[PDB]
Subunit: 255 residues, 4 copies
């Protein structure tokens, strides 16, 4: 049983899918269109021989996050994997950064990770097994201007991830944080557009520029690729891979 937050879109959907395909029962979560979401839940459950549940908890609130985990154990019988992926973005200079936006990014991008982890650990320890996979970002290791809340939160996730690993040292549980580079999800398309209109160029020229500025390989990372990474971390080969970061950024953090 694997619970993946914000798994109704982009990266989360990729990791949810890739885990289903490994025989794990999935608990979807996130927003968007209800009809399309049910179509995703049913599809995955019938495309792979596994139980797929949907819990639309709003992770911007601790209780709701812990609630998602307790109810996930109550309806699935157990929780093996917790992929804390749900996240949002907002760009502006520090002095123009709305407090409300700062609060929202910290509550979802960082605090949800704490609440989910805190509710999951008790079940994982008692069962002698556990896999906590936090979706941080290259921005959990380096920074970019105008993304203070995001960079702070992502760095927070990396830090919290390490603590989780140390508290669970050898108990059959491991906590890690994938740190993706650009992934052309809706979260990045909004920026591509912003860049496209900023320099009066077309949607595809801005995409290439935004990509070359940070990504050496000049190629976007994929949810499927990220799913493959999440699956590996879930594997037995990664039994001793804990409290670390795994960068899938095509050279972003190398230079």
């Amino acid at each position: 049983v694997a619970v993946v937050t914000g798994s109704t879109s982009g990266i989360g959907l990729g990791i949810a899918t890739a885990l289903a395909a490994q025989g794990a029962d999935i608990v979807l979560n996130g927003f968007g269109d209800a009809a399309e979401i049910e179509k995703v839940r049913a599809g995955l459950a019938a495309q792979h021989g596994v139980k797929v549940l949907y819990d639309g908890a709003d992770l911007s609130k601790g209780e709701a996050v812990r609630g998602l985990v307790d109810n996930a154990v109550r309806q699935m019988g157990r929780i093996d994997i917790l992929v804390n992926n749900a996240g949002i973005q907002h760009t502006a200079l520090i002095e123009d950064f709305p407090t409300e936006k700062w609060d929202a990014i910290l509550a979802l991008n960082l605090s949800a990770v704490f609440h989910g982890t805190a509710a999951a650990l008790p079940h994982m320890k008692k069962q002698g097994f556990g896999r906590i996979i936090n979706i941080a970002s290259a921005h959990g290791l380096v920074a970019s201007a105008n993304k203070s809340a995001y960079v702070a939160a992502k760095h927070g996730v990396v830090g919290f991830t390490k603590v989780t690993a140390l508290e669970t040292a050898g108990q059959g549980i491991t906590a890690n944080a994938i740190c993706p580079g650009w992934v052309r999800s809706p979260l990045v398309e909004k920026q591509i557009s912003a860049l496209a209109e900023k320099n009066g160029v077309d949607q595809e020229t801005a995409a290439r520029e935004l990509l070359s500025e940070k990504q050496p390989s000049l190629q976007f990372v994929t949810p499927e690729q990220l799913g493959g990474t999440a699956v590996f971390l879930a594997s037995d080969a990664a039994a001793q891979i804990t409290g670390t970061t795994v960068s899938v950024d095509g050279g972003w953090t190398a230079r």
Copy 2:
């Protein structure tokens, strides 16, 4: 020297912050103190530094857990001192427990002061520093902003958050005469640590984290802050300066 400059140091009524405010005052910087404790002892410290170093020293008891109070502290510093060259975001609290036993109220509190206050203070200071063409933002993080320790999930997450926030601050101000850096201390024997010293007694703990087996002093951190505030550090920005007796090398 820092004559003619104004430094605001949060949580400077004691510990690390007091050593930093003192070191800066000894360089001729005007100072704005902040923090809690005994009001009489705070006034003695405030008047004492002003007299000993011949600088102007004000006190502002803003409760840093409140965003608007943090921004108010910076703005009133500018209104009363005339400018703000150095912002030292040092105030912070701790709490130990397993992630599962970690009180939510404790999580929110650590984050609000240890991380959010750095944001609020920095946001308030930036506009003034950009206009001034000069600026030095010094965030007191910790070795825990680079590595972790069990039972300190909130603290480590916040500290790491500060490190990241510092890098973003540096990038948004790069080339404008402003730098942003995070000093990351190792063990420093102050009230925040003597409390953990006594705790372990009911059950020389440097061997664990600090390879040199020596404590870092408020004075040494004050000297590091004075260095980052100097002109030789004009191109030192968006980075961490570890003062941890080897903590992070191994």
Copy 3:
């Protein structure tokens, strides 16, 4: 696929050689049964990598005997403990010769073909000592940090050409529990198998965009 695991005669290199076998890759052993147990062309080249010529050779020696080169695993390396002042200049150059220079030679001989093919997976076996240090191991830690940095440059030089380069930084393996207690929080050694799977994973097409980085398999070593 064709993978050249150096120092794969024993320990970690063996584990990596083994795992790449199970995935259907033609192993090109090295160092000082599997061909049948896995159904692959397993060769042996005892070329001593402590010589840039031997290394640059061991590579091309596979481009002709295997006809192809897809995966290069620079694993071979030695260790010597001694204070910096008491550290033999002989050993220093030895540790740097193999542990670091061999990677640059092997990599220098591999890239030309990988770029031609349009596919490559350079996997260097560094160490936690490529990110952190320990007293009395100045040559190892230095070389390892060196590998780490070299790995990053190899990645930037091959970014977007279908070739990646990463560094696995293993923690305590087995080639006592008080030794673990001090560096490994999990208190459980890392196995060549796990390293094999990791190397396997890094070779996966899922790690296509994973380049110029390090994968710490240390049971928590670097986390604290």
Copy 4:
């Protein structure tokens, strides 16, 4: 200040090294310069620093590409100046080229100077510093000791090794009144970079501040590291890169 202390600065006949030796001299420390160049030009610099700062200044043209010469520089320093409090391993060289087009000659050269010299120089100084109860090894690494660039494999490789070596040096000396740290600078407009400028937009790619780092600033940094306020700063890197590594 640094009155009574002796500081050896490798490759200090010009550029960064000279700026560091000059800042240390200004604090009152006796200086041992090292490097190549014109005999009269070097003497002018040597005699000038000594006269201007009121300290003793020796010049040793030892070739640091040789392990014994490097160790000889240090012993000669202790022989002439009577002690060694500060060692700044700064001499270095550069060569750009693809890993495949990279001359093995250049690879081993860059490694012996940029990396082995730090080792040799440090081994020679430690016995003296441990006996003294005080020491400061200041290695001049680079932003490339933490991150990398294309076509500088040997350079990046060497710098990272220095960074790692610095950490071991610190652990092996922890608590003995000795610290070892590595300054990692970004672009400094000197010959090492002027040869690449030919081969305000060169900064634009790596240095956010769009301003070069100066030898004076690196010297001020070496001075801070040698001060007592830095007694507990050891085994770490100090980046002076205008934001290079922040992003």
